[PDB]
């Protein structure tokens, strides 16, 4: 039994070996208690403000929308300490770990952004941190790897399976299975077994809360739609949460289309996968006809989670949120456009969301619409990637 519903419609659940259930139940209980503890909230708010830099700016993009009836704002999570929205919830989870008397942190990471966020939160709050990262990822993420070590975290390469994020995910669970008494597993996205999808959303919901207050302040009304990329679903659910009950506000999640949905090389399981059970949850998965779990492909390292948070699958099923996809080339074009017209270098992950807003604008230039794109991260990290591609294409 649980204190909170582990499901969003048919999606979610706690599909973990029996040995891990006590850890999940323990975590759910501490989370429910923390949420009703004004002292926990004040400590979390203090770190977010004085250490991470919240509230983040909401930047209007007139140069981009000129000549159209689209007004576009970018929620600036790229300005959060660490360079991405990941920082929000690792601070909340690190505080939860301490509330439970835990002294160690276990984390998984693909692009290394969450790994870096877990390491910085652990460094700040005196937690011993160990990070699992698929060997293929450590290889292409040595900068983030070094950051993690400078911050005192132990980075552990995972060579099992495809040696990527899903593999690091398994290894994290395996570890926690035998150490949850003293270690907390700091999951990096709004997915996995309950209570994680719920906790991650709640520890990211300030994104949407701030956006709503900022948009009301600047435009005197709610956005016609908020747009966010979806890898695992944390930055998107963080932006969406506070707007779910505002029925007039469209919620648009953007999955990576990679080389194109038809090529099969993409990372859009929500709209182009099949429901399965993996990583402790029932949700749309990138998987073979046989049921073996596959990888998500995208020019962006961060949209590599081969599944998607159960709450997104649920919001999609009832029609509350709409999910689309954006290709590598479309994301690259938005990346260039934002650099040239606004002087902001967006993460390639976030560029997928901006690319979709650019499409909404360009396809119907005379449609009056107020849009907010969640700029989940900065793209300084993607400069090498973009450089090579542009050079390669002459």
């Amino acid at each position: 039994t649980t204190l909170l519903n582990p499901y969003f419609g048919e999606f979610g659940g706690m599909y973990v070996p029996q040995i891990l259930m006590p850890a999940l139940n323990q975590l759910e209980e501490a989370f429910v208690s923390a949420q009703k503890d004004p002292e926990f909230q004040a400590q979390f708010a203090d770190l977010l403000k004085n250490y991470a830099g919240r509230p983040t700016a909401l930047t209007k993009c007139q140069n981009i929308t000129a000549g159209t009836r689209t007004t576009l704002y970018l929620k600036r999570e790229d300005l959060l300490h660490g360079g991405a929205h990941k920082t929000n919830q690792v601070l909340g989870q690190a505080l939860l770990a301490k509330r439970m008397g835990k002294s160690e942190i276990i984390a998984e990471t693909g692009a290394g952004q969450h790994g870096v966020a877990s390491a910085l939160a652990s460094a700040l709050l005196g937690l011993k941190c160990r990070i699992y990262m698929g060997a293929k990822d450590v290889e292409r993420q040595s900068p983030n790897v070094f950051r993690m070590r400078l911050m005192g975290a132990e980075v552990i390469p995972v060579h099992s399976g495809s040696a990527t994020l899903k593999d690091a995910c398994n290894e994290a669970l395996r570890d926690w299975s035998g150490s949850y008494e003293t270690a907390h597993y700091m999951l990096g996205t709004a997915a996995g077994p309950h209570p994680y999808p719920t906790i991650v959303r709640e520890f990211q919901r300030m994104i949407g809360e701030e956006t709503k207050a900022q948009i009301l302040d600047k435009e005197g009304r709610l956005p016609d739609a908020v747009i966010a990329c979806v890898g695992g679903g944390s930055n998107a659910i963080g932006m969406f949460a506070d707007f779910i009950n505002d029925t007039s506000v469209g919620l648009i999640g953007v999955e990576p289309g990679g080389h194109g949905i038809e090529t099969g090389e993409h990372g859009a399981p929500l709209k182009h996968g099949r429901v399965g059970i993996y990583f402790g949850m029932k949700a749309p998965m990138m998987q073979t006809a046989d049921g073996q779990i596959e990888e998500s492909y995208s020019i962006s390292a961060g949209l590599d989670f081969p599944s998607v948070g159960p709450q997104h699958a649920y919001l999609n099923s009832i029609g509350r949120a709409d999910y689309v996809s954006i290709t590598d080339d479309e994301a690259l074009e938005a990346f260039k456009t934002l650099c040239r017209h606004e002087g902001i270098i967006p993460a390639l992950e976030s560029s997928h969301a901006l690319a979709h807003a650019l499409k909404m604008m360009r396809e119907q230039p005379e449609k009056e619409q107020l849009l907010v794109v969640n700029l989940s991260g900065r793209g300084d990290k993607d400069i090498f990637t973009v450089h090579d591609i542009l050079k390669a294409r002459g």
Binding site: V16, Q18, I19, P22, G276, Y278, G280, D290, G291, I293
Partner: protein
């Protein structure tokens, strides 16, 4: 069928504990795996626990992870696993055969269809590694409708409620990973088999002495496979030797 019930009845009449080895189907190849399995049976295995290679065995340690790697290197698929199961049962009519599965492979094309397929090939039980009792209803129901015993792991710290649920939900045997054994018997749980760490003959005798109906060697068998990959013949010889010793330790 009632293979587990018939087996434990017989072992009891002989004041004997059961010895159950685990191996990954198709490891290192389909042909060698079938030979490995026949050798385990000839050497005295009372039942079998067979794994179907899965891409992300988040509930398994390094040994099993590598067994899957080897199986996949050989191109092993669940479909081939079910063909092997049919061949295994066709050769051995009474040994209980239990599968150790990951939820996605059971759920993939319909939970009911999966257990129906288990019943068709002659499988006796299924332990879904990542389905806790709390999420087990559809699995348990489908299993029972197809005369398949749903097996559950009773963890070290299993509190009373869990003990009661496991006792009520499981069939065939309880996968145990004194008080625990007494409570399980008290709640009329399926006979408990001690797992984890069972890698020496003395551990088999200790399990039976503690009150367990037997022991499952979760990975010791796979290690032997991994060590003798170079010589298939020596592999089977060593497998025969180990199982013989383990089984002998279960006798009164």
């Amino acid at each position: 069928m009632e293979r587990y019930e018939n087996l434990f009845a017989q072992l009891n009449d002989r004041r004997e504990g059961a010895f159950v080895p685990f191996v990954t189907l198709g490891d290192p190849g389909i042909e060698q795996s079938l030979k490995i399995i026949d050798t385990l049976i000839d050497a005295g295995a009372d039942a079998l626990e067979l794994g179907v290679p899965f891409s992300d065995p988040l509930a398994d340690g390094p040994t099993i992870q590598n067994a899957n790697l080897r199986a996949f290197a050989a191109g092993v698929t669940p479909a081939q696993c079910f063909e092997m199961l049919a061949i295994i049962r066709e050769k051995h009519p009474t040994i209980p055969i239990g599968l150790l599965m990951y939820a996605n492979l059971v759920f993939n094309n319909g939970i009911d269809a999966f257990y129906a397929r288990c019943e068709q090939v002659g499988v006796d039980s299924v332990l879904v590694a990542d389905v806790p009792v709390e999420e087990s209803a559809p699995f348990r129901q489908a299993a029972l409708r197809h005369n398949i015993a749903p097996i559950f792991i009773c963890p070290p710290n299993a509190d009373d409620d869990l003990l009661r649920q496991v006792a009520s939900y499981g069939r065939g045997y309880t996968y145990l990973l004194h008080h625990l054994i007494e409570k399980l018997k008290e709640y009329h749980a399926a006979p408990a088999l001690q797992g984890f760490g069972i890698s020496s003959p003395e551990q088999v005798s200790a399990a039976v002495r503690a009150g367990a109906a037997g022991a499952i060697s979760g990975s010791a068998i796979v290690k032997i496979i991994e060590k003798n990959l170079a010589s298939p013949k020596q592999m089977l010889a060593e497998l025969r030797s180990f199982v013989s010793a383990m089984k002998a330790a279960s006798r009164a």
